Amino acid sequence: YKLICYYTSWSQYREGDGSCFPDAIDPFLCTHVIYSFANISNNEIDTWEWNDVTLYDTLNTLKNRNPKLKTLLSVGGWNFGPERFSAIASKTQSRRTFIKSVPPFLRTHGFDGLDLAWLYPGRRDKRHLTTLVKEMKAEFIREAQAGTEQLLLSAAVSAGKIAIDRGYDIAQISRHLDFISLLTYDFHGAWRQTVGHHSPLFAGNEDASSRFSNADYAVSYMLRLGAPANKLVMGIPTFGRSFTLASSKTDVGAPVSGPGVPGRFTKEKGILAYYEICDFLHGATTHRFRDQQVPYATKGNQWVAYDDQESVKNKARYLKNRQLAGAMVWALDLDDFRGTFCGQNLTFPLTSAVKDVLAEV
Numbered sequence: 001y002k003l004i005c006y007y008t009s010w011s012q013y014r015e016g017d018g019s020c021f022p023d024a025i026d027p028f029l030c031t032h033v034i035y036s037f038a039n040i041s042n043n044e045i046d047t048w049e050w051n052d053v054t055l056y057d058t059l060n061t062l063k064n065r066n067p068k069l070k071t072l073l074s075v076g077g078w079n080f081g082p083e084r085f086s087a088i089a090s091k092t093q094s095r096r097t098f099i100k101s102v103p104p105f106l107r108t109h110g111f112d113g114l115d116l117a118w119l120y121p122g123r124r125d126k127r128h129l130t131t132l133v134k135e136m137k138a139e140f141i142r143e144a145q146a147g148t149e150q151l152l153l154s155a156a157v158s159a160g161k162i163a164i165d166r167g168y169d170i171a172q173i174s175r176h177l178d179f180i181s182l183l184t185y186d187f188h189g190a191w192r193q194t195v196g197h198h199s200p201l202f203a204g205n206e207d208a209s210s211r212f213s214n215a216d217y218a219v220s221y222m223l224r225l226g227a228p229a230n231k232l233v234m235g236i237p238t239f240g241r242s243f244t245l246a247s248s249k250t251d252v253g254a255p256v257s258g259p260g261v262p263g264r265f266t267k268e269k270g271i272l273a274y275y276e277i278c279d280f281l282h283g284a285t286t287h288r289f290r291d292q293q294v295p296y297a298t299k300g301n302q303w304v305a306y307d308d309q310e311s312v313k314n315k316a317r318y319l320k321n322r323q324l325a326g327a328m329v330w331a332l333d334l335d336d337f338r339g340t341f342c343g344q345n346l347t348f349p350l351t352s353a354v355k356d357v358l359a360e361v
């Protein structure tokens, strides 16, 4: 079983303990570690942060302690403009440019593959996205003729029914990608004035219309569409989403007024790291959607939807039972990586739990 773990570049700048660098990563924790977001310049892959080539080095040294550990570089991301991605893949000329540029870049900095994080192809991009994948892989196959281990190619894919249908030819790209990461944690929030859980595993028979907004559907649909289980990787949250309540109500459907107040370390309205939540939990009221199988907490006028050890194990067994290829954890740097926020003296508690379940039968 695979355990893909993303690490984000900008997490280095959080203050105090919040600060996280590649060397804080347990080299045996995950099987695949993904350095988050490389940039594109003049149609060539390139660095982003001022010290990337240094962090690259840091991250890839872990490979000296664990020879089996594989690393990848993800392109795109949220601060990368989809349009941008669009422009590059639309023209065979700029596309080939970008592609030819990749292999050397990765060989140079020591990465074992490329992760495409084109954040949401449009109805008009579906045909190009497929192209970009074919040719990219075709190139990776050609570069392997030089006696080195073939480069890996993967992609983070939305788990949103409409999004999927609108921009992905899942049956095609699945044959060319080594694995696909399902962003199964973006089901709510997305600015809709009512409290709700972003990563529910299940259907929850109550108040519906969505029905498609849970990991289960997502997984099932993907399967239906043609993507093999042995290439699917389910996404697992290591952060929670917060909301500022507009009334004293707390149950399902509760009126919301906007995102939650920022955390002392991540400082971004609407998000919390698990380690911030661990601190938030002191003096709060914890609840759990039985049908969906995920927590949520409240304190004052703040409402939080998050994933805990159990929920995570839950989802992990789930993916095992459907026989998928593995789990994907968004934000090793959002987990309690110091192991000094969530109590039970343990480093990477959430990520660790997934591993434990995956190591089980």
Ligand SMILES: *[C@@H]1O[C@H](CO)[C@@H](O[C@H]2O[C@H](CO)[C@@H](O[C@@H]3O[C@H](CO)[C@@H](O)[C@H](O)[C@@H]3O)[C@H](O)[C@H]2NC(C)=O)[C@H](O)[C@H]1NC(C)=O
Residues within 6 Å of the ligand: 039, 040, 041, 042, 047, 048, 049
């Ligand atoms: C990720 O790569 C991007 C593409 O190379 C790069 O984007 C930018 O490229 C230049 C370099 O700064 C920008 O320059 C400006 O825009 C106008 C002219 O177009 C000037 O008048 C102005 O003075 C300024 O120099 C481009 O605007 C911008 N281009 C695009 C298409 O985004 C990014 O800098 C890079 N991001 C990071 C974080 O490194």
